[PDB]
Symmetry: C3
Subunit: 425 residues, 3 copies
């Protein structure tokens, strides 16, 4: 019994009521006013991993596997009133952040009105190290290096909040400094506070022409705070223990090289790390390396200091000739953009990692760990196929060798293979 008069509707046009808008899609969406006042970008990244691995990587030394998303970010960011930016990256694979506090890769607000100086607030990784500054989309090896695993608090947000100032300097350098509160309380409920500094001199800072040297410093205050002091490196093999899908389960060997899961309040106070970075690129050839040293300083006399030192060096070469992109803002490498659309770009890489842990609190042998300094060396050799700007397929061989620590089989080395399908939008 419902009825209505019919209408002739205007069709086909797309307009706006404010400033002219430009819209773009490469699989996601970008919308922006041409006066630069407002913008919105929806994107993301999918990293689908399959790996198999044995020896030291597993407890009994037999072959385990893993089938998981390393990352599955949805990424929302935008600009309002020209100078105010936000970026919210949440990880559907649940590898980043937590159930309690949100699965954030990033949730930040940045004021850019003092360009080149930026002021950044919210939940975001502190700036320590070149490989960490580099987007996880474009890190050359499948996982970041083992030296960071000696003190991963230096460049993770740990479910807290921070404030950072950063700037490029005269088109030849980049500096950042920040303070953060991390999610661990002392006996009064006051969070661990942390300071970071990073400074890079990069007189050459473009794709295929990079010369880069930098320094990093991180400090945190653990006064009267119970915390996990364990150093537990995965040595390039994420699948030994990971969220986002299937892993090695009870047979994964993510081993404790030093420290303990529950260091009591009052056991430690000062924790500091110094780092160096260096990078060079000429056309398709690049070399980069980082070194860091940690001192976790005991407070109570019953406890001894824990020290650790580590480094990596990486060679990479684009067989098809393209350069790795480089950005002075953030002093970081970025993507490879394929020149040949029919075969894509093909990149080979080798990274060597070396770490040492000195924990004088270990005074007795266990079944798998000998008194003294524990050590590991890792080799990561692989290929990245950039099919196009959106899709990257990778395969890598990973090998590790240890000293004064084994798995239950007595293995002092292990190896594995990892394959990844990545889609960026």
């Amino acid at each position: 019994l419902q009825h209505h008069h019919h209408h002739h509707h205007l069709e086909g046009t797309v307009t706006t009521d404010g400033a002219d808008i430009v819209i773009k899609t490469k699989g996601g969406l970008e919308v922006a006013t041409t006066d630069k006042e407002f913008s919105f970008k929806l994107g993301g990244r999918l990293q689908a991993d399959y790996s198999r691995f044995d020896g030291f990587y597993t407890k009994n030394g037999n072959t385990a596997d893993a089938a998981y998303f390393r990352r599955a970010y949805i990424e929302l960011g935008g600009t309002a009133y020209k100078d105010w930016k936000y970026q919210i990256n949440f990880d559907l694979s649940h590898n980043t952040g937590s159930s309690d506090n949100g699965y954030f890769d990033e949730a930040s607000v940045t004021y850019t009105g003092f360009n080149p100086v930026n002021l950044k607030f919210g939940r975001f990784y502190p700036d320590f190290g070149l490989e960490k500054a580099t987007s996880s989309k474009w890190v050359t090896a499948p996982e970041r290096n083992a030296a960071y695993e000696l003190a991963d608090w230096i460049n993770t947000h740990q479910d807290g909040m921070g404030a950072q100032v950063n700037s490029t300097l005269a088109d030849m350098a980049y500096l950042s400094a920040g303070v953060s509160a991390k999610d661990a309380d002392d006996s009064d409920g006051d969070s661990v506070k942390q300071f970071n500094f990073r400074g890079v001199f990069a007189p050459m800072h473009e794709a295929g022409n990079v010369l880069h040297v930098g320094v990093n410093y991180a400090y945190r205050d653990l006064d009267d705070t119970a915390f996990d002091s364990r150093i537990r490196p995965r040595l390039g093999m994420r699948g030994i223990a990971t969220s986002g899908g299937n892993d090695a389960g009870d047979n994964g060997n993510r081993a404790t090289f030093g420290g303990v899961s529950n260091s009591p309040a009052g056991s430690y106070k000062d924790d500091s790390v110094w780092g160096l970075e260096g990078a060079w690129a000429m056309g398709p050839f690049s070399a980069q390396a980082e070194y860091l040293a940690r001192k976790l300083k005991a407070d109570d006399n019953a406890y001894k200091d824990i020290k650790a030192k580590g480094y990596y060096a990486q060679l990479a070469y684009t067989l098809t000739g393209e350069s790795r992109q480089y950005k002075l803002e953030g002093a970081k490498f970025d993507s490879v953009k394929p020149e040949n659309k029919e075969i894509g770009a093909w990149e080979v890489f080798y990274r060597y990692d070396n770490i040492k842990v000195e924990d004088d609190n270990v005074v007795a042998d266990t079944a798998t760990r000998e008194v003294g300094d524990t050590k590991a060396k890792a080799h990561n050799l692989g290929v990245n196929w950039y099919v196009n700007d959106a899709v990257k397929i990778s395969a890598a061989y990973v090998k590790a060798k240890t000293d004064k620590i084994t798995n239950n089989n007595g293995d002092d080395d292990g190896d594995g293979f990892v394959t990844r399908l990545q889609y960026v939008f």
Copy 2:
């Protein structure tokens, strides 16, 4: 060996195959047909908090802190076939909703064909109270009032489902009524059912010209249902216990003023709350207040009724002269839109809260709680800087004073400071 013929592609235009579309961005995205048949809006809100607090707010009285996102909503909403709307707001900070049932601020469908009458279905807060009706983007104080904390079931969805009818009445009033199922079962697995009514007379209902009086009623049936009867107010300080980041941990004092965590099935049945609201605004000056009273009625003779009464009153003044927006649809205040683009808008506020809990089931002193009526008063004094329509920076001082309840230090008062950076898109 792959090859193909080259093409000349048409570039630059943006069109549609249906009715004309208008697109907008202020940091998010809106897309809508001009015939009002279809629309889509992607937005959200980030609320980044840092606070420090002591006295009654902590167990030992020493200073704790908190560094967390109060809310981090992603907001998707749209219209189809003119009269059918959806709204899905999910909270990445995990402060709203749950791991079991979804982190929903809202997941609703609304039929608007009977305009001004709306029919709303799904998971959404029942309509009780002016400050609750007001968007959490634009609530003047950093947290909502303590009177609601006496019975927070009246205007939370508790992971259930509901149906609501609402309407404005002759451009002078607003009414709503709803039924909901809440996520708690009786011994047969049948959910707690709840009824809400709200009615407001607002003959003046525009920004800078408001006169508003209203009544609220809520009822729920707890027959044969085990439930948490605790009244545990945070008294303006979210950081004593919160998700979305770091809080006061084991030293936070979110104290139980009355009730118990596990009231057995059969202990209570009727639970009802009556409320009043009043608001007035003239230009940049506004005053608002609410009062409510709860009776939780015992069923089994071993149990005594629990009663509670509370109110708040708030003064607010925009120093820079702008009015608080007001909407008759929902009978609620909304944002401040800054007039001066160089300095933004500056707002000062004071809210006073007063609550009383009468629990005759408490018959013996504990170390921190005395037999009789427990009471609290709170004062919230602060500044909101609306930098622009998207960004609001706040700072507030909060003080509380209690009667017949203390922390472990014997403190009967406490205070703290909270700062927030908010970004809306």
Copy 3:
């Protein structure tokens, strides 16, 4: 003291810097280049359920209820460089996927360059069965059939990863085959591997003209793997036990018809399922049916094989005359598109389910389960109102009858009613 020169800004136009773009909205958003190289689609589905049920569906036989979202998907998908697609569907109701590994309905990458052959990778349901292939938006009954509940591993992703090849064949058939790793490890940490095949002959494959016969096969290797072998059908009543809101709680009877929650490593190895499908449609009338049989083969001599057999048959008729859509790609039914905009489309359906479980490991009676074959029959009778393309409102009556298993009241049958409000965008 801040000041600036004023500007005249160009307003109103919407353009792009690349190939021409077409944008669309029906409540969500689609953006695509006209050369088919790039596209993006944001959509989703909300399924709001309320049900009441008693008898066998509850433990004591009294009436329970449920008020929950069955699904609340946000759906992001797109195309890049013509031949590379992604699809990421995450479920805000937390009914799909997990807290540990992500709430994915789907997270996949598809290469389509070998059209009609597709290559699909990531986390997605293996292809077994017509009703499972059919979108959950458009499955006719409120829940899928009970035969699938006899072996739900055959067409669920179980938080793992997979690779699938599929193709239509000469506009008369459809085939798919895939391998997957499922999230359960043997004692070495190696995941359960699974193979699927599906093949359908559908010489008539359009809306209102369907003739469809198909075969399914699934196999998994459980060697040295501890696993949950329970068969626990909900028999059409989701609310007896569900996430996404309120359910029957401790009085829900999702009963174990066979198998055990912790079958030890070494107890079983081969697990295989064969299935048949058939479908026919002429205008508004459709008939479909599936049959499957499972053999879970014991490894260790202490264990006996577990077998199960089940089928369903469904009649459906659109009273208002419209056809159910059908797609050869995926060999599946899809939506009903209403022809009359004032009253929508009205569909009646009846589905009959029949299952039998043979578990010779059950050698003693329990209080509710008798030695021998357990059986259930279910009847699902209901109405779907397609208000418009976006909104579907459903109501259904469900009845079940069991053999050799009861609830605690001794009930051998039960019934219930389910209502759903669905919004697709």
